[PDB]
Curated annotation (Swiss-Prot):
Section of the entire sequence shown: 24 to 228 of 3354
Biological function: Cadherins are calcium-dependent cell adhesion proteins. They preferentially interact with themselves in a homophilic manner in connecting cells. CDH23 is required for establishing and/or maintaining the proper organization of the stereocilia bundle of hair cells in the cochlea and the vestibule during late embryonic/early postnatal development. It is part of the functional network formed by USH1C, USH1G, CDH23 and MYO7A that mediates mechanotransduction in cochlear hair cells. Required for normal hearing.
Species annotation: Mus musculus (Mouse)
Top-rank taxon, per record: Eukaryota
Protein name as catalogued: Cadherin-23
Subunit (UniProt): Interacts with USH1C and USH1G. antiparallel heterodimer with PCDH15. Isoform C1: Interacts with CAMSAP3; leading to inhibit CAMSAP3 ability to induce microtubule bundle formation.
Gene name tied to this protein: Cdh23
Amino acid sequence: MQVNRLPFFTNHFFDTYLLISEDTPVGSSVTQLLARDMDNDPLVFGVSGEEASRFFAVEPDTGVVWLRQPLDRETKSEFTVEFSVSDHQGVITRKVNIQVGDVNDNAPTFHNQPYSVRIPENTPVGTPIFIVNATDPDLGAGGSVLYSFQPPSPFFAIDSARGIVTVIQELDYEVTQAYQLTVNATDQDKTRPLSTLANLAIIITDLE
Ligand SMILES: [Ca+2]
Ligand SMILES: [Ca+2]
Ligand SMILES: [Ca+2]
Ligand SMILES: [Cl-]
Ligand code: NA
Ligand code: NA
Ligand code: NA
């Protein structure tokens, strides 16, 4: 007799990877599973696995794969997903690597606040007194932070790439005993930069 011929997948992505942008809206089709059954049997498609089934859903008859929950590359940057196809006599599965594509969706975050430093009034021009650090988990320019004072200061400077704060004019405890500066950390996304502000207190101490 004839033995049933099981279906097999014909998508090219099973051998490489599927890319899905993290800004993909829920409900969006992310691909369509394609399969052949040489008996011309009607086929039913699925996704298997607890995590995969949470994030992705599959139209049983058409094989269209849907986004069921929002993606977030900064929480999980890829998935290994098992898809199935069945002619109702047997079930064939195959795995695909899904890469989550980055969008610039995070502002920088400053660590180890509150920021404060005490320096003596004879601290000379050029002296580094504080290093600010903000991180940005996005990729490329959207993850590359630049620092500035906003508003600017005539007494202190901050290195835009390194976050190193230096004295740029002589200090004088009699004139000013404290400064309140605002550091801006911005990513360098070309279309939609995101930024964050942090306070820096510089306290001047008198020699005696
Ligand atoms: Ca078949
Ligand atoms: Ca991102
Ligand atoms: Ca960013
Ligand atoms: Cl297959
Ligand atoms: Na499932
Ligand atoms: Na994200
Ligand atoms: Na970064």
